[PDB]
Amino acid sequence: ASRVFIVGGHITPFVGKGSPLFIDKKHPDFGKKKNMTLEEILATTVQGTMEHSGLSGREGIVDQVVVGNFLGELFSSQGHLGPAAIGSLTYGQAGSKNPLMYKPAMRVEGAAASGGLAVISAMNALKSGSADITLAVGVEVQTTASARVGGDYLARAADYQRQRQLDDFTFPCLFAKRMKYIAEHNHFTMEDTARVAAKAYANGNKNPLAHMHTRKLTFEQCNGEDPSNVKFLGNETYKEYLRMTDCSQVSDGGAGVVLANEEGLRKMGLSPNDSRLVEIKSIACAVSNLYEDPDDACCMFTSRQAAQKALSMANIKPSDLNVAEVHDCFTIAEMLMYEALGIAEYGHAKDLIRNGDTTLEGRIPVNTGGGLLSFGHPVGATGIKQIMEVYRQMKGQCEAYQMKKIPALGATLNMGGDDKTAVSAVLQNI
Amino acid sequence: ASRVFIVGGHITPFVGKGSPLFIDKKHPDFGKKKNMTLEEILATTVQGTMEHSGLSGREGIVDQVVVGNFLGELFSSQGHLGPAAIGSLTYGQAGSKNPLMYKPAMRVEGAAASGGLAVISAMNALKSGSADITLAVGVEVQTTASARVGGDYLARAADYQRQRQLDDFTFPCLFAKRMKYIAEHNHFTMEDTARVAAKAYANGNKNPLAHMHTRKLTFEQCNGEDPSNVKFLGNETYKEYLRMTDCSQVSDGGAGVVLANEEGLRKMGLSPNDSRLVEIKSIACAVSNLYEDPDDACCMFTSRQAAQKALSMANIKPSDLNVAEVHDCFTIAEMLMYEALGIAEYGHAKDLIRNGDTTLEGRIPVNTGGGLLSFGHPVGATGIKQIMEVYRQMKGQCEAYQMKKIPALGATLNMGGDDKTAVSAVLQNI
Numbered sequence: 018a019s020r021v022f023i024v025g026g027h028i029t030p031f032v033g034k035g036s037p038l039f040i041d042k043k044h045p046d047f048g049k050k051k052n053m054t055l056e057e058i059l060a061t062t063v064q065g066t067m068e069h070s071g072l073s074g075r076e077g078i079v080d081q082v083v084v085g086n087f088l089g090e091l092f093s094s095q096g097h098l099g100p101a102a103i104g105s106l107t108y109g110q111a112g113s114k115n116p117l118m119y120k121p122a123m124r125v126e127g128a129a130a131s132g133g134l135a136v137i138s139a140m141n142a143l144k145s146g147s148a149d150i151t152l153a154v155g156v157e158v159q160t161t162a163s164a165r166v167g168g169d170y171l172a173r174a175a176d177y178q179r180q181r182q183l184d185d186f187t188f189p190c191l192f193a194k195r196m197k198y199i200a201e202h203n204h205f206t207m208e209d210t211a212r213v214a215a216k217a218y219a220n221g222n223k224n225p226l227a228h229m230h231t232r233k234l235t236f237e238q239c240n241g242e243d244p245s246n247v248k249f250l251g252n253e254t255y256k257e258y259l260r261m262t263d264c265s266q267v268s269d270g271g272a273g274v275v276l277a278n279e280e281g282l283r284k285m286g287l288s289p290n291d292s293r294l295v296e297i298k299s300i301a302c303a304v305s306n307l308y309e310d311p312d313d314a315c316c317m318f319t320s321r322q323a324a325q326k327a328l329s330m331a332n333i334k335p336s337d338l339n340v341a342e343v344h345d346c347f348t349i350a351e352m353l354m355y356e357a358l359g360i361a362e363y364g365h366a367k368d369l370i371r372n373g374d375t376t377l378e379g380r381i382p383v384n385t386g387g388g389l390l391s392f393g394h395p396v397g398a399t400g401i402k403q404i405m406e407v408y409r410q411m412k413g414q415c416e417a418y419q420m421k422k423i424p425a426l427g428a429t430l431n432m433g434g435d436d437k438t439a440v441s442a443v444l445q446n447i
Numbered sequence: 448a449s450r451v452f453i454v455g456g457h458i459t460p461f462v463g464k465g466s467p468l469f470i471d472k473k474h475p476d477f478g479k480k481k482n483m484t485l486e487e488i489l490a491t492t493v494q495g496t497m498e499h500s501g502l503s504g505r506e507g508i509v510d511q512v513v514v515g516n517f518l519g520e521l522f523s524s525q526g527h528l529g530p531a532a533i534g535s536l537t538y539g540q541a542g543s544k545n546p547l548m549y550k551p552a553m554r555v556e557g558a559a560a561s562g563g564l565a566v567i568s569a570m571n572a573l574k575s576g577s578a579d580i581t582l583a584v585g586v587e588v589q590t591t592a593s594a595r596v597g598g599d600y601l602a603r604a605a606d607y608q609r610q611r612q613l614d615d616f617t618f619p620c621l622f623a624k625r626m627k628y629i630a631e632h633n634h635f636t637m638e639d640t641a642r643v644a645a646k647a648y649a650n651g652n653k654n655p656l657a658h659m660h661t662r663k664l665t666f667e668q669c670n671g672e673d674p675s676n677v678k679f680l681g682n683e684t685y686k687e688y689l690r691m692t693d694c695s696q697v698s699d700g701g702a703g704v705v706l707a708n709e710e711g712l713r714k715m716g717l718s719p720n721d722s723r724l725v726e727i728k729s730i731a732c733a734v735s736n737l738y739e740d741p742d743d744a745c746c747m748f749t750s751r752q753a754a755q756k757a758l759s760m761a762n763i764k765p766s767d768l769n770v771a772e773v774h775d776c777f778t779i780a781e782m783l784m785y786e787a788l789g790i791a792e793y794g795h796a797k798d799l800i801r802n803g804d805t806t807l808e809g810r811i812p813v814n815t816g817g818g819l820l821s822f823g824h825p826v827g828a829t830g831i832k833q834i835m836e837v838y839r840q841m842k843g844q845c846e847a848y849q850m851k852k853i854p855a856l857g858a859t860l861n862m863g864g865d866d867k868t869a870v871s872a873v874l875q876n877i
């Protein structure tokens with residue numbers, strides 16, 4: 018009966034407009050250097066993952082690689098990222114020896130759950146006899162298209178035929194539509210969602226990897242007291258329910274993790290009690306119907322299903338959790354995710370955000386490094402960044418945002434589209 | 448490792464320009480009816496797979512669904528096909544009960560190997576404790592763009608930065624480039640490649656599902672003796688080496704299979720010695736470097752690797768095989784695929800095609816129903832269509848193209864891009 022261990026991994030800085038690392042007209046190197054391409058990010062990410070996992074010089078003992086990516090075929094005109102991953106170890110050195118040659122690889126995809134799906138696929142290979150050491154890397158580049166062209170691409174997450182007509186920013190508009198229903202049922206408020214953003218940015222300010230690291234926002238600004246915090250939607254039914262600060266960033270970046278089973282650890286010279294490890298006690302995936310939406314906007318049924326499956330499988334309750342990473346593609350989502358995960362009861366995420374319970378000094382800190390709101394959302398990377406952020410907290414590696422009490426139990430909740438795909442894992446510190 | 452059984456599956460007609468089933472100006476219903484959308488193909492495919500697998504009324508015993516698709520995000524503006532699959536069983540019956548709700552689902556992608564990769568992913572879930580019965584479906588719609596546009600999209604399978612420049616028809620140009628090198632090393636000829644096409648069209652003529660079922664072509668025509676069989680490439684270095692008839696069809700269609708382990712069969716009331724079943728003795732995947740090409744165009748090293756891994760895992764040799772399905776994205780590729788699979792030694796595919804050994808009455812029939820050339824190539828479906836074609840021959844289901852001696856051992860070889868991803872299975876009849 019075969020356990021799965023996080024051995025190590027790597028998260029790149031997440032970059033886009035508003036980051037000093039993002040090269041644009043404004044930037045000292047505009048004209049001299051360029052932002053990384055997807056290929057370069059995938060290269061930096063696979064290499065970093067191998068390095069931080071003790072695999073440098075022995076990359077050949079990895080059995081297989083899975084890539085999570087949503088829109089590479091659109092933003093970067095590039096699909097078929099498996100062989101891209103296979104050429105990533107020695108990218109840009111012609112004819113170099115390549116220990117990864119001929120190993121199995123593929124790209125998996127389920128909108129913003131694509132990294133989460135890459136981890137589950139790697140885990141099935143670990144439990145199946147196919148692999149003892151797997152690499153799961155997630156990468157995304159989205160800064161190559163205008164905001165509106167980008168919006169149309171991200172609508173690939175939605176039921177395009179049915180929902181694209183709502184707004185050029187289809188996917189935001191779907192969360193603004195939830196917020197309307199949520200406000201109508203007094204489930205929570207736009208002040209509450211502002212408090213989520215306040216928290217995300219304050220955390221991001223302590224994370225040099227975060228897209229919005231350098232951006233400071235007060236609750237007041239996040240609540241709409243700032244002329245630049247615009248209600249940008251075109252759809253007049255939903256316009257008033259979503260501010261710029263309520264939305265995740267359009268970022269580029271990657272995250273990688275090495276996952277091993279007990280034979281994998283043996284091959285690396287490691288024991289299962291090794292203090293650099295974290296055990297994935299469980300992982301579960303739930304998918305609903307792309308074509309049909311539940312009436313109750315105040316419940317993410319699919320994400321609730323995934324979390325309840327993961328916790329049950331690991332035999333714990335949400336109150337046992339010491340830390341969580343959840344899918345705050347909007348502030349609206351973070352609130353819904355506290356309830357989906359079960360750290361708050363239905364209609365009570367608001368108590369949590371009012372009382373500070375999910376802040377860095379709260380009793381259940383969530384998205385300690387900034388979340389998708391401030392850390393950023395390079396779509397395919399996000400599912401794997403969530404795992405590595407729990408890992409990093411457990412190993413005491415988060416520096417200015419390190420939790421004071423090293424967490425014993427953590428949970429991840431990764432969602433694709435409008436709660437249509439959900440992946441949730443339970444992690445146990447070793 | 449539990450064993451894995453094909454319980455049933457389904458192939459749709461493959462449609463595009465040249466099929467009487469494809470609606471265009473010249474078709475009796477042009478203006479009245481439309482061709483199926485990707486959602487409609489996925490619906491028809493998921494449904495038909497369940498119907499020909501005995502899962503009707505019990506679809507809930509399926510543990511997971513994996514969709515293979517390459518370019519849905521481009522041609523149909525739609526990613527996130529996992530929840531599209533979960534909504535496919537009851538598509539257009541609004542509000543209906545849905546036994547697939549909340550089950551795990553994802554899309555996998557490796558260019559034209561995407562369906563092969565679906566099958567292996569579904570197999571790992573079956574060997575891992577996660578699944579006892581799985582549904583693997585592959586679907587594609589590509590008729591929504593012009594030829595040249597479609598060329599650019601399919602170039603997502605290439606190293607786009609490095610190779611898109613070769614020609615609008617990037618993929619055909621890359622195989623024309625192999626043909627030039629092949630001719631310079633007398634490996635085989637354009638007359639040989641014409642014979643592959645003659646065979647593919649003669650087989651397609653006996654297959655009412657084939658895109659080119661209606662189209663009769665002699666060897667002469669396939670060999671360039673037909674003014675309309677044009678050398679269409681723009682790239683003057685490679686132009687002379689590729690005719691229209693050497694190329695797979697731009698088709699829309701789907702294919703699905705239900706795969707169960709021994710516990711899955713038990714649940715369905717089936718024994719593993721049930722003569723409706725086929726066993727997948729082995730499956731393997733090999734992936735090379737997207738960014739670097741081997742010098743010897745006369746060897747598909749990656750496909751050779753995948754086949755040698757499969758056959759070895761099954762403990763057989765190519766001479767044990769009775770039937771195969773291989774990836775004839777071009778006639779040129781079929782010839783290479785004989786050598787990759789090992790049914791001809793290096794430099795000897797030509798003997799095979801000259802002697803008729805891979806015809807329907809040969810000793811090792813290949814692509815008995817027309818291959819990607821005549822059956823058609825809806826990219827994501829192809830890998831699964833290949834499994835089902837071996838299954839169908841084994842179960843005596845192929846009608847005018849049924850082999851007279853029921854095959855005991857079959858192989859598939861599925862490839863993505865320019866021999867950068869390969870997946871090969873060994874099937875054993877029961």
Ligand SMILES: [Cl-]
Nearest residue numbers: 128129174434
């Ligand atoms: Cl999404």
Ligand SMILES: [Cl-]
Nearest residue numbers: 558559604864
């Ligand atoms: Cl391809």
